[PDB]
Amino acid sequence: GLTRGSFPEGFVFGTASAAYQYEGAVKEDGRGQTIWDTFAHTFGKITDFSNADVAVDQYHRFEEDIQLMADMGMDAYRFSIAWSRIYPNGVGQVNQAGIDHYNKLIDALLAKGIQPYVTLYHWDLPQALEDKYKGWLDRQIVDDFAAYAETCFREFGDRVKHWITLNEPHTVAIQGYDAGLQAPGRCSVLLHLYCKAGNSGTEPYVVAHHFILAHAAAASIYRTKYKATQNGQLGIAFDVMWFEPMSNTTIDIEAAKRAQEFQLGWFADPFFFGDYPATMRARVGERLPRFTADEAAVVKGALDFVGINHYTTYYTRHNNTNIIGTLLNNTLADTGTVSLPFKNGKPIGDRANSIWLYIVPRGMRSLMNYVKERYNSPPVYITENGMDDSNNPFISIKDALKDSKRIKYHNDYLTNLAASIKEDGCDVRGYFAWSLLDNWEWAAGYSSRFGLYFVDYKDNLKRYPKNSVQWFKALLKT
Numbered sequence: 395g396l397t398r399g400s401f402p403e404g405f406v407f408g409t410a411s412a413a414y415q416y417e418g419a420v421k422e423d424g425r426g427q428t429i430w431d432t433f434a435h436t437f438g439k440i441t442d443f444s445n446a447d448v449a450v451d452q453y454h455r456f457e458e459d460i461q462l463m464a465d466m467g468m469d470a471y472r473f474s475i476a477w478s479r480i481y482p483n484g485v486g487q488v489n490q491a492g493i494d495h496y497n498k499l500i501d502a503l504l505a506k507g508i509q510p511y512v513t514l515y516h517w518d519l520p521q522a523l524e525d526k527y528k529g530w531l532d533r534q535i536v537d538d539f540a541a542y543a544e545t546c547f548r549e550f551g552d553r554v555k556h557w558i559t560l561n562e563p564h565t566v567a568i569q570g571y572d573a574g575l576q577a578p579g580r581c582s583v584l585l586h587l588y589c590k591a592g593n594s595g596t597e598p599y600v601v602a603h604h605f606i607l608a609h610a611a612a613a614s615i616y617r618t619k620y621k622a623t624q625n626g627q628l629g630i631a632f633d634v635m636w637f638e639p640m641s642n643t644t645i646d647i648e649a650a651k652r653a654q655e656f657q658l659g660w661f662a663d664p665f666f667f668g669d670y671p672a673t674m675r676a677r678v679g680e681r682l683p684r685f686t687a688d689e690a691a692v693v694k695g696a697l698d699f700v701g702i703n704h705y706t707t708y709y710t711r712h713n714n715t716n717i718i719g720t721l722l723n724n725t726l727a728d729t730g731t732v733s734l735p736f737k738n739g740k741p742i743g744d745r746a747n748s749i750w751l752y753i754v755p756r757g758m759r760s761l762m763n764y765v766k767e768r769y770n771s772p773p774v775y776i777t778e779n780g781m782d783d784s785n786n787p788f789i790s791i792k793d794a795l796k797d798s799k800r801i802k803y804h805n806d807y808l809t810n811l812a813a814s815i816k817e818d819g820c821d822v823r824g825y826f827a828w829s830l831l832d833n834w835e836w837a838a839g840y841s842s843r844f845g846l847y848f849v850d851y852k853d854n855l856k857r858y859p860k861n862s863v864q865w866f867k868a869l870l871k872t
């Protein structure tokens with residue numbers, strides 16, 4: 395089947411992780427509290443009552459884990475820097491122990507020939523910024539993020555050449571501020587009674603605006619002060635479901651395109667064209683912030699590459715409604731669409747463990763072509779792709795390792811990826827599996843197993859290779 399030869403010369407293969415999901419050591423070496431420490435320690439927020447205080451303890455076990463990557467022949471590792479290990483209070487006194495830790499990790503990776511692809515922000519805002527000004531809701535976050543980013547460029551950018559400023563700003567905006575299902579857990583209480591505060595109709599657009607400005611601010615610093623000498627690149631990882639029309643009719647075809655504009659375009663149109671999608675301006679109206687001319691000029695062009703986190707594809711239909719006033723405004727209603735993995739009662743594909751994750755390999759190819767055509771063939775990295783098993787206490791570890799479904803998932807998505815590059819002309823530069831190890835899946839806690847390696851939570855976090863480890867090792871052989 396697939397080999398390295400199925401992909402362009404120099405194509406980069408890796409696994410991906412995130413600090414809060416992997417590291418543990420939440421109180422160690424000066425680390426500041428984050429909005430996810432607060433959220434994980436709040437009743438009702440995590441489905442299995444768990445937390446990531448220890449997680450899979452990668453803070454102490456990264457060398458063991460790096461050898462696991464090297465065992466497969468991985469080229470690269472995507473990981474995040476916990477902001478609160480560098481500035482425990484978000485701004486102010488740098489925490490030297492945080493710098494020293496990430497230097498050891500970066501050096502250990504490079505010692506093994508594995509390139510670091512580093513995410514600056516993977517959701518773990520210092521609680522001090524949430525406390526001071528409600529974090530992403532305030533324009534101050536722009537300057538504060540840019541300063542944190544600058545410290546990372548200054549400390550690590552002699553060795554780190556691939557930066558992802560933000561991970562999934564769309565997920566954060568919607569899950570954090572419309573549904574209130576992720577930190578800081580804000581929403582319109584009239585829509586979801588579990589929330590303490592928020593406004594599903596307004597806050598997501600404010601947060602998204604600030605994310606875009608925050609990236610632009612970091613990128614401006616990078617280009618002006620670091621890029622010439624360091625010779626690296628900056629991008630973002632966008633969460634992107636592919637959307638197929640629920641019917642092959644012009645109304646639903648327009649609906650699927652619209653749902654795409656509201657998901658990827660919300661962020662990517664500003665970065666390529668200097669403004670939000672016209673459909674968002676039309677439908678969200680005054681609730682959607684406006685860029686100034688000077689802001690547009692710093693935002694347009696601020697990506698060196700587009701990271702795509704892609705798992706699944708849904709059907710999308712047009713939706714007509716007649717909302718009962720401002721009170722019930724929400725992002726989904728604003729799109730004028732509804733998207734579901736079901737058509738005429740039939741699911742779009744087999745499903746992984748996650749209730750949202752449908753297995754639809756063709757959507758990888760369809761998305762790569764959409765990005766090519768809409769954005770004039772920018773460089774793309776698949777910054778996340780993978781699937782999860784359940785955490786099943788009724789089966790042996792040995793049986794837990796037989797992840798044949800995961801193998802078929804990667805095989806089929808990568809086959810479609812290879813085709814988009816070779817047949818379709820898409821400029822895809824690399825691919826990162828979610829994830830290296832089983833880990834703490836946010837509000838799903840330890841109920842979801844995404845790892846190439848199985849982690850025994852009952853035996854001091856012992857790592858065992860699932861069948862997919864051998865499969866990747868064989869794929870990556872030279």
Ligand SMILES: CCCCCCCCS[C@@H]1O[C@H](CO)[C@@H](O)[C@H](O)[C@H]1O
Pocket residue numbers: 412415561562565632633634635703704705706778828835836844
């Ligand atoms: C891509 C569109 C799918 C929509 C919503 C689900 C978003 C996935 S969150 C994303 O993927 C991993 C696996 O879920 C997380 O654990 C990572 O930390 C995070 O980066």
